Every structure is written in structure tokens, then in C-alpha cells.
């Protein structure tokens, strides 16, 4: 199933929100940059106890390359969630069963050294003038789309 990697995300509100969404959709694991975030009050406000029920794993940003390489060997497709020239449109993207979603930092997105390690980048198409979506919302949309496709395939 689905691994969501939030190690690049800085804000406890985004992490806490994502924790709730991952739990609701039955993600296999949510990966965070520091287990300390789980006990942050802003995180807890948004996660509404989801952390009790969702597997959580710490992978610090410096360890991401090695972690993602290991997941490839286990049969995961490493999917960057990002707006890039080479990104595939989410409306056109059929998820592999073993999908891993890498979310970007709120300010910096996914850095070039990590883009290089990805199997694919997937982009949510936009119609308005605002540059991008919130990172938690972005992750929610891909988590949902993966889930929708899997429910329909099964």
C-alpha cells in the first residue's frame, strides 16, 4: 500500500493535519523528520489522536536518500509530489500498488538532489493565480486519489 514521507515538512500544523488524513485513509506509515513533532501541542490539536492509530516512523532529512533507495529495493515507486516541468498530471496518473509519496518543504519544495532520486514527480493541475496548494492539502489529494483508484481496482 502507501507510504507518505513528510520529513521535509517543517510546520507542526501541517504534520498534525497530515497525520489525521493518513490515519483516516489507512496509509501504511507516515514518515516524519523528528518523532518530537508528535508531542508538539500544535501537532496534537490537528491530529486529534490519529497518532495513536497510525504507524509513525522517523527518517531525518539527511537519511532520506538512503531510506528511499531502500524502499525502491522493497518494490516501492518513489513519487515526488511537486510542480516540475517533467511532472505527470495527477488526472492522468495511475498509481502503482506500492506507492511512496514524498512531500516538499513549505518554502523550498523538494530540493534538486532529491528530485534526482525520484522515479516520477506528480503535479496537481491548477486553474487560479495562486502559485501552489498547501502541502497537507496536496498530500491529502494524492492520498485520496491513490485510495479511490485502489478501491475501484479491488
Ligand X SMILES: Nc1ncnc2c1ncn2[C@@H]1O[C@H](CSCC[C@H](N)C(=O)O)[C@@H](O)[C@H]1O
DSSP helix/strand/coil, 41: helix
Nearby residues of 79 by Cβ (< 8 Å), 6 or more positions away: 95, 99, 100, 101, 102, 118, 119, 120, 121, 122, 142
> Which of the listed partners (ligand X, a copy of itself, none) does 23 bind, with a CB threshold of 5 to 8 Å by partner kind?
a copy of itself
Look-up of cell digits 488524513: 21
Question: Which listed range, 40-48, 53-61, 66-74, 105-113, lies at the site for ligand X (CB under 6 A)?
Answer: 105-113
Grid cell of 9 as nine digits: 515538512
> Which of the listed partners (ligand X, a copy of itself, none) does 118 bind, with a CB threshold of 5 to 8 Å by partner kind?
none
> Which of the listed partners (ligand X, a copy of itself, none) does 32 bind, with a CB threshold of 5 to 8 Å by partner kind?
none
Of the pair 73, 127, the CB lying nearest a copy of itself is at 127
Question: What is the Cα–Cα distance from 125 to 117, expressed in whole angstroms?
Answer: 23
Closest CA to 96 of 75, 113, 70, 81: 75
Among residues 62, 75, 128, 154, the one that binds a copy of itself under rule CB under 8 A: 128
Task: Report the b/e string of 57-69 with b at 16+ CB within 10 A.
Answer: eebeeeebeebbe
Of the pair 39, 65, the CB lying nearest ligand X is at 65
Measured distance between the N- and C-terminal CA atoms of the chain, rounded to whole angstroms: 13
Residue 82 CB, nearest approach to ligand X (Å): 5
Among residues 132, 147, 149, 150, the one that binds ligand X under rule CB under 6 A: 132
Which residue ranges make up the site for ligand X (CB under 6 A)? 81-83, 103-104, 106, 109-110, 123-124, 126, 131-133, 135, 138
Which residue ranges make up the site for a copy of itself (CB under 8 A)? 17, 20-21, 23-26, 46, 48-50, 52-54, 90-91, 124-130, 132-134, 136-137, 140-141, 144-145, 147-148, 151-152
Amino acid at each position: 500500500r502507501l507510504i507518505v514521507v513528510a520529513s521535509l515538512i517543517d510546520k507542526p500544523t501541517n504534520l498534525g493535519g497530515l497525520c489525521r488524513t493518513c490515519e483516516v485513509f489507512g496509509a501504511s506509515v507516515l514518515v516524519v523528520g523528528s518523532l518530537q513533532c508528535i508531542s508538539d501541542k500544535q501537532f496534537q490539536h490537528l491530529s486529534v489522536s490519529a497518532e495513536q492509530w497510525l504507524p509513525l516512523v522517523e527518517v531525518k532529512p539527511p537519511q532520506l536518500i538512503d531510506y528511499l533507495q531502500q524502499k525502491k529495493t522493497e518494490g516501492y515507486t518513489i513519487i515526488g509530489v511537486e510542480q516540475t516541468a517533467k511532472s505527470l498530471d495527477l488526472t492522468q496518473y495511475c498509481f502503482p500498488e506500492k506507492s511512496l509519496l514524498l512531500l516538499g518543504n513549505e518554502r523550498e519544495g523538494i530540493p534538486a538532489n532529491l528530485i534526482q532520486q525520484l522515479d516520477v514527480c506528480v503535479e496537481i493541475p491548477q486553474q487560479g493565480i495562486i502559485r501552489s496548494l498547501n502541502v497537507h492539502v496536496s498530500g491529502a489529494l494524492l492520498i485520496w486519489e491513490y485510495t479511490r483508484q485502489q478501491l475501484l481496482s479491488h
